[PDB]
């Protein structure tokens, strides 16, 4: 996260770290959606241009974390993957369309003060909140700058951007399964996701029921916090049918 701030303790209890076993390193962010299911970006698990194709056994999920590097004894829980599910129409060749993946955990994780699932939006939630100018929140342990690493989880609040503005900022073909967020040059305020924040949640707090919903998944950008560029997010509600199908079949 570029131009964010240190998270408060328990501020993002659904935040998940995807951790590579060997070499031991941060792979991506992710989110907890129930006691056995974790959501992330497909490109965290499968991206042939970079020779990325992880299997279950290559990764661990670490839940309830704050410190990036510390083993948070008595606070974090480390879980093993039972199965990975990548959207079958994930477009890694072109534009990261449908950049979404689910991971089923071997055992349920116990909820705590630091570990708790985020809600997924329904149609009404999406319609009311996914509006230009409405702000959401993005969190992760990714780079602090484009071209280093935070000691603790970082947070930044960013406004959703009008679709014509998103399209005009980029040469990538934008789809309905994506939205963009970030401040414009004239707005003065800054912030963006960066390398290692991928797969992390973009969340909004409903003013109707005061619950946090995951509206987006950190998907792609062009640099980090560059003037005139925006961060792009997987549109969670647009893919909820696939999410539900997977959970209904395999849960």
């Amino acid at each position: 996260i570029v131009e964010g701030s240190d998270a408060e303790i328990g501020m993002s209890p659904w935040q998940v770290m995807l951790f590579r076993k060997s070499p031991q390193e941060l792979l991506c962010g992710a989110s907890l959606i129930s006691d056995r299911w974790v959501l992330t970006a497909a490109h965290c698990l499968l991206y042939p241009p970079w020779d990325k194709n992880f299997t279950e056994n290559d990764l661990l999920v670490r839940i309830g974390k704050h410190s990036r590097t510390r083993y948070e004894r008595n606070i974090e829980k480390i879980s093993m993957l039972e199965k990975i599910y990548i959207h079958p129409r994930y477009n890694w060749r072109e534009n990261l369309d449908r950049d979404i993946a689910l991971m089923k955990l071997k055992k349920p994780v116990a909820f705590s003060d630091y570990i708790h699932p985020v809600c997924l939006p329904d149609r009404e939630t999406a319609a009311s909140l996914l509006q230009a100018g409405y702000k959401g929140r993005v969190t992760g342990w990714g780079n602090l700058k484009e071209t280093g690493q935070p000691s603790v989880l970082q947070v930044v609040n960013l406004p959703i951007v009008e679709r014509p503005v998103c399209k005009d900022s980029t040469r990538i073909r934008i789809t309905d399964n994506m939205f963009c967020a970030g401040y414009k040059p004239d707005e003065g305020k800054r912030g963006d996701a960066c390398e290692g924040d991928s797969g992390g949640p973009f969340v909004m707090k409903s003013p109707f029921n005061n619950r946090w919903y995951q509206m987006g998944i950190v998907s792609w950008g062009e640099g980090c916090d560059r003037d005139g560029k925006y961060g792009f997010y997987t549109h969670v509600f647009r893919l909820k049918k696939w999410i539900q199908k997977v959970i209904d079949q395999f849960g």
Binding site: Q24, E25, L60, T69, R70, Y71, I78, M80, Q149
Partner: peptide
């Protein structure tokens, strides 16, 4: 710079 995690994992 990651601290080692328990062997159980």
């Amino acid at each position: 710079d990651f601290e080692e995690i328990p062997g159980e994992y």
